[PDB]
Design a protein around this nucleic acid. Structure first.
Ligand SMILES: [Mg+2]
Ligand SMILES: [Mg+2]
Ligand SMILES: [Mg+2]
Ligand SMILES: [Mg+2]
Ligand SMILES: [Mg+2]
Ligand SMILES: [Mg+2]
Ligand SMILES: [Mg+2]
Ligand SMILES: [Mg+2]
Ligand SMILES: [Mg+2]
Ligand SMILES: [Mg+2]
Ligand SMILES: [Mg+2]
Ligand SMILES: [Mg+2]
Ligand SMILES: [Mg+2]
Ligand SMILES: [Mg+2]
Ligand SMILES: [Mg+2]
Ligand SMILES: [Mg+2]
Ligand SMILES: [Mg+2]
Ligand SMILES: [Mg+2]
Ligand SMILES: [Mg+2]
Ligand SMILES: [Mg+2]
Ligand SMILES: [Mg+2]
Ligand SMILES: [Mg+2]
Ligand SMILES: [Mg+2]
Ligand SMILES: [Mg+2]
Ligand SMILES: [Mg+2]
Ligand SMILES: [Mg+2]
Ligand SMILES: [Mg+2]
Ligand SMILES: [Mg+2]
Ligand SMILES: [Mg+2]
Ligand SMILES: [Mg+2]
Ligand SMILES: [Mg+2]
Ligand SMILES: [Mg+2]
Ligand SMILES: [Mg+2]
Ligand SMILES: [Mg+2]
Ligand SMILES: [Mg+2]
Ligand SMILES: [Mg+2]
Ligand SMILES: [Mg+2]
Ligand SMILES: [Mg+2]
Ligand SMILES: [Mg+2]
Ligand SMILES: [Mg+2]
Ligand SMILES: [Mg+2]
Ligand SMILES: [Mg+2]
Ligand SMILES: [Mg+2]
Ligand SMILES: [Mg+2]
Ligand SMILES: [Mg+2]
Ligand SMILES: [Mg+2]
Ligand SMILES: [Mg+2]
Ligand SMILES: [Mg+2]
Ligand SMILES: [Mg+2]
Ligand SMILES: [Mg+2]
Ligand SMILES: [Mg+2]
Ligand SMILES: [Mg+2]
Ligand SMILES: [Mg+2]
Ligand SMILES: [Mg+2]
Ligand SMILES: [Mg+2]
Ligand SMILES: [Mg+2]
Ligand SMILES: [Mg+2]
Ligand SMILES: [Mg+2]
Ligand SMILES: [Mg+2]
Ligand SMILES: [Mg+2]
Ligand SMILES: [Mg+2]
Ligand SMILES: [Mg+2]
Ligand SMILES: [Mg+2]
Ligand SMILES: [Mg+2]
Ligand SMILES: [Mg+2]
Ligand SMILES: [Mg+2]
Ligand SMILES: [Mg+2]
Ligand SMILES: [Mg+2]
Lengths: 119, 272, 88
RNA sequence: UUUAUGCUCU
RNA sequence: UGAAAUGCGCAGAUACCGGGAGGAACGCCGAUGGCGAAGGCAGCCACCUGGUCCACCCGUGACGCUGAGGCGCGAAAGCGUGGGGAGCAAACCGGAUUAGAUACCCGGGUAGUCCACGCCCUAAACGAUGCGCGCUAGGUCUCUGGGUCUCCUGGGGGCCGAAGCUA
RNA sequence: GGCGAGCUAGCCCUGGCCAGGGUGAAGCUGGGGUGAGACCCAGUGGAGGCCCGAACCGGUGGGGGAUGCAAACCCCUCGGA
């Protein structure tokens, strides 16, 4: 519903997938993509190559509405991070910055049995 | 606390009575500000319109003060805490500097001999009444008005209260004792504190007669009736409901909602 | 807490002689002060068991002394107790 | 990320 | 997830932003550290309060040690009455796996986990080492006091070790 | 369409009634007990859809009655009190 030059890019990187949403300066998503949108199912999406393919389909759709610059923001470990960060830069979109905002509790909620292991 | 009894008769074994230590020189009530004679009647003009009522101890009605803006600014001393048979809460007789006497529903904490006051002024401590709009968000409160100048209606039951949750226009957002989130007008008076006598919920009538004293006559199950009388009557040796459980008058009684749909009030609600 | 002059007051009042800063009674009396303090603290904070432990220790100690004193001088035993209000 | 089992006495 | 499937989603999900509600646990500091008799104790603040150590050598003058009974405390789970319930999660349901899978893995999920009060009295409640006192080489690391502050001295916490002990 | 709650059922207002004996809750006081308690023991006390039993309210079993004394009675027995 608009064309904005300055923007913001978000990288959600989980063990199972990588998804990138590109927002306006305000945070409202302009367009998004992920490993599955590329064309993969199952665990293929948790791949770094799937992340690359993804982050490009993101940027490409962004430039459609006229996207030039972004302030890339990554959240979460995973094989998507770097390859997804790299991919962005290597096509249009100049990366004005690279922030890491992966959320972490100061010991909040008890985690699932799977992510607790030690004591 | 709550009084218990050694089982020197059955029923006395489970019977439990209210603790009346909180009650200051009650016994004789305050003939002036109340009481009035209370017309004890179980039906309307002619016919029974609420089943299973009647009998039970005679009562004098203590005419309590459910609108305090009546005397803005005028402080008053709490003279006594009294027993009131017409409610679960206790009442507090208070003498105004005016020389005017009135009863209030005694809040939890409210000590005998302390000062009380109501108005936009009014320190935010227990016993004081204020238009909702002037009460710090997050405080618990009781005896709230639902519309300005119409008198307290909400949170008056022993142990009950309401929390001011936020503000929105000329309205503030309360969480009613039911758990319902409701908007009430800011001009509506409330009074800080919970109601008190909160152990109330923990008494055990103990015997059939105890229920008779409170004016509750035996309640009979539709299951024990005949088809003439109730959806659940008849059978021939006990019986499941054999249909969706119903009231004597036919409507379902397990789930079926009853609040009128299109109701002006609906626009000011948001919970259970 | 028991302040300095607050405990000094007691030290002097029980001292067997100007200069006595730890005789049998000055100790007994001293303990008695803390004990009565804690005893009133625990009445309020009752789920505070750790602190109650010490109480038992202070109480036990006090007893040992008084038993010694009532062994060496059955006179200033009555005297000490009476003046402190103990042994119930 | 698919396995479990091995008769009796020497 | 091993890979998946159940599950959620075009009734607008995930990802992103702003607002609000609510409960529980306190990241970095943090240690192989500290405190407590033990169980055990970890954001910050204040109040109430126990133990403990050091310096001074001032006071009592053996007033000690241990301790069958007794009394108190006692993790987790569990129980009663109220409340509270976000995440988690016995039981239970479903998806997978397998010959079967009442398990292991996945998606749901109720007691419970939380608070008040009252019970229960267990444990690898472990240093698998009862408490007190004296005596018998040192080396090094550390916490915390006092010192005439390279070193000395006191109380703790670790490692290596004289003599000796030990299958 | 009217007449009925002067029988009976429930409820509302105002009054009245329940011999005598038994059991002995809490609380209180005192004593012991403790660091303080819980608590224990006495005495006091006089609770209860508590006990025995008249009035009173009932109607359990049996007998009698059966064109009755009586269109629901009488005797013995029994329930609550
Ligand atoms: Mg995946
Ligand atoms: Mg964030
Ligand atoms: Mg009518
Ligand atoms: Mg009328
Ligand atoms: Mg009429
Ligand atoms: Mg109830
Ligand atoms: Mg019934
Ligand atoms: Mg029938
Ligand atoms: Mg009919
Ligand atoms: Mg019918
Ligand atoms: Mg039926
Ligand atoms: Mg049948
Ligand atoms: Mg076999
Ligand atoms: Mg073999
Ligand atoms: Mg075989
Ligand atoms: Mg053989
Ligand atoms: Mg869909
Ligand atoms: Mg589907
Ligand atoms: Mg649509
Ligand atoms: Mg959000
Ligand atoms: Mg230690
Ligand atoms: Mg431990
Ligand atoms: Mg201290
Ligand atoms: Mg000396
Ligand atoms: Mg001497
Ligand atoms: Mg023995
Ligand atoms: Mg106990
Ligand atoms: Mg325990
Ligand atoms: Mg527990
Ligand atoms: Mg519980
Ligand atoms: Mg519960
Ligand atoms: Mg299963
Ligand atoms: Mg299956
Ligand atoms: Mg098969
Ligand atoms: Mg296996
Ligand atoms: Mg699970
Ligand atoms: Mg779950
Ligand atoms: Mg159970
Ligand atoms: Mg034991
Ligand atoms: Mg342990
Ligand atoms: Mg062994
Ligand atoms: Mg040892
Ligand atoms: Mg021992
Ligand atoms: Mg030290
Ligand atoms: Mg130093
Ligand atoms: Mg050492
Ligand atoms: Mg060694
Ligand atoms: Mg050797
Ligand atoms: Mg008619
Ligand atoms: Mg009549
Ligand atoms: Mg008479
Ligand atoms: Mg009598
Ligand atoms: Mg007494
Ligand atoms: Mg006494
Ligand atoms: Mg008597
Ligand atoms: Mg008595
Ligand atoms: Mg009776
Ligand atoms: Mg009887
Ligand atoms: Mg009898
Ligand atoms: Mg009788
Ligand atoms: Mg008889
Ligand atoms: Mg008969
Ligand atoms: Mg009959
Ligand atoms: Mg008969
Ligand atoms: Mg007959
Ligand atoms: Mg006959
Ligand atoms: Mg005949
Ligand atoms: Mg009789």
């Amino acid at each position: 519903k608009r064309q904005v030059a300055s923007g913001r890019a978000y990288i959600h990187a989980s063990y199972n997938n990588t998804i990138v949403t590109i927002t306006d300066p305000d945070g409202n998503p302009i367009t998004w993509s992920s490993g599955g949108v590329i064309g993969y199912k199952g665990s293929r999406k948790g791949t770094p190559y799937a992340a690359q393919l993804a982050a490009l389909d993101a940027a490409k759709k962004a430039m459609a509405y006229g996207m030039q610059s972004v302030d890339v923001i990554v959240r979460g470990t995973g094989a998507g991070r770097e390859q997804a960060i790299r991919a962005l830069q290597a096509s249009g979109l100049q990366v004005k910055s690279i922030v890491d905002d992966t959320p972490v509790p100061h010991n909040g909620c008890r985690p699932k049995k799977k992510f607790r292991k030690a004591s | 606390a709550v009084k218990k009894f050694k089982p020197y008769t059955p029923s006395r074994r489970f019977m439990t009575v209210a603790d009346f230590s909180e009650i200051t020189k009650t016994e004789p009530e305050k003939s002036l500000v109340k009481p009035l004679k209370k017309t004890g009647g179980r039906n309307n003009q002619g016919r029974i319109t609420v089943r299973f009522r009647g009998g039970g101890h005679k009562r004098l009605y203590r005419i309590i003060d459910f609108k305090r803006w009546d005397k803005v600014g005028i402080p008053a001393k709490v003279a006594a805490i009294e027993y009131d048979p017409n409610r679960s809460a206790r009442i507090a007789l208070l003498h105004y500097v005016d020389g005017e006497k009135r009863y209030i529903i005694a809040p939890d904490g409210l000590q005998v001999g302390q000062q009380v006051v109501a108005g936009p002024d009014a320190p935010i401590q227990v016993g004081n009444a204020l238009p909702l709009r002037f009460i710090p968000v997050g405080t618990v409160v009781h005896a709230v008005e639902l519309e300005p100048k119409k008198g307290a209606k909400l949170a008056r039951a022993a142990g009950t209260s309401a929390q001011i949750q936020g503000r929105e226009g000329d309205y503030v957002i309360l969480r009613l004792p039911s758990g319902e989130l409701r908007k009430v007008h800011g001009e509506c008076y409330a009074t800080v504190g919970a109601v008190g006598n909160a152990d109330h919920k923990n008494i055990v009538l103990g015997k059939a007669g105890r229920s008779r004293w409170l004016g509750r006559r035996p309640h009979v199950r539709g299951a024990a009736m005949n088809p003439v009388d109730h959806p659940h009557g008849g059978g021939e040796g006990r019986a499941p409901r054999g249909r969706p459980p119903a009231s004597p008058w036919g409507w379902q009684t397990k789930g079926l909602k009853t609040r009128k749909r299109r109701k002006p009030s609906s626009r000011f609600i948001i919970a259970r | 807490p028991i302040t300095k002059e607050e405990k000094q007051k007691v030290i002097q009042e029980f001292a067997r002689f100007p200069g006595d800063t730890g005789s049998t009674e000055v100790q007994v009396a001293l303990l008695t002060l803390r004990i009565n303090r804690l005893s009133e603290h625990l009445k309020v904070h009752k789920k505070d068991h750790h602190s109650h432990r010490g109480l038992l220790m202070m109480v036990g100690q006090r007893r040992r002394l008084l038993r010694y004193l009532q062994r060496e001088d059955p006179e200033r035993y009555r005297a000490l107790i009476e003046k402190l209000g103990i042994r119930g």
